[PDB]
């Protein structure tokens, strides 16, 4: 009866030296029952990455929606949408459903391909933008993620260091939440290569 914690799951994002990382768990459940171990919560539209936590049906719907909107954007503008811009489009789209919202906690990460700047942001279900230098967190284990990140994080990490840090924040937060976990994926994003790593984690 609280739509934001029927299915469970989490997303975290971090900035480093000329890179960003964004990670999620793989659980999809119906309350106590784990149902799927392969439910990824991160999507990309060109070089802009979007993670979505919350009600899975809305997660799926919103991915389908932003694919649609960015495809048309590309056709009309003749370029890939940038993270600063995509962030604004996410905000508009959620607030448009102000009094009947999507029960989601989206997170945007990527590198602006003109300015080279790393960029992350997070949103509430009705579109409020939270831009941050350091990290954004989302999902049923968000308290834990806030704790892990605020203590583990330091500015200007190299991509392979940032990888360890974001992975340890995710894993240890997931393990203190009954509704998150069951696998995990980490995206390391540099100006033009993106590595995707699946983490080994406890399956309970």
């Amino acid at each position: 009866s609280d739509p934001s914690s029927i299915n469970g799951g989490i997303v975290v994002a971090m900035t480093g030296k000329d890179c960003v990382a964004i990670a999620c768990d793989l659980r999809l459940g119906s309350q106590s029952l784990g149902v799927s171990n392969k439910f990824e919560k991160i999507f990309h539209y060109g070089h802009v990455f979007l993670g979505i936590t919350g009600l899975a049906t809305d997660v799926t719907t919103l991915n389908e929606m932003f694919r649609y909107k960015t495809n048309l954007y590309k056709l009309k503008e003749e370029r890939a949408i940038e993270p600063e811009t995509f962030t604004q489009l996410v905000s508009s789209s959620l607030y448009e459903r102000r009094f009947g919202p999507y029960f989601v906690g989206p997170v945007v990460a990527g590198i602006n391909s003109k300015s080279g700047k790393p960029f992350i942001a997070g949103f509430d279900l009705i579109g409020c933008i939270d831009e941050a230098k350091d990290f954004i967190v989302s999902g049923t284990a968000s308290d834990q993620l806030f704790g892990m990140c605020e203590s583990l994080y330091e500015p200007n990490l190299e991509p392979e260091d940032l990888f360890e840090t974001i992975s340890q924040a995710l894993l240890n937060a997931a393990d203190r939440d009954a509704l998150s976990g069951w696998g995990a994926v980490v995206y390391i994003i540099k100006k033009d290569e993106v590595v995707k790593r699946y983490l080994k984690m406890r399956q309970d």
Binding site: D124, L125, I126, C128, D130
Partner: peptide
């Protein structure tokens, strides 16, 4: 939703 975040308040101020």
């Amino acid at each position: 939703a975040x308040l101020x």
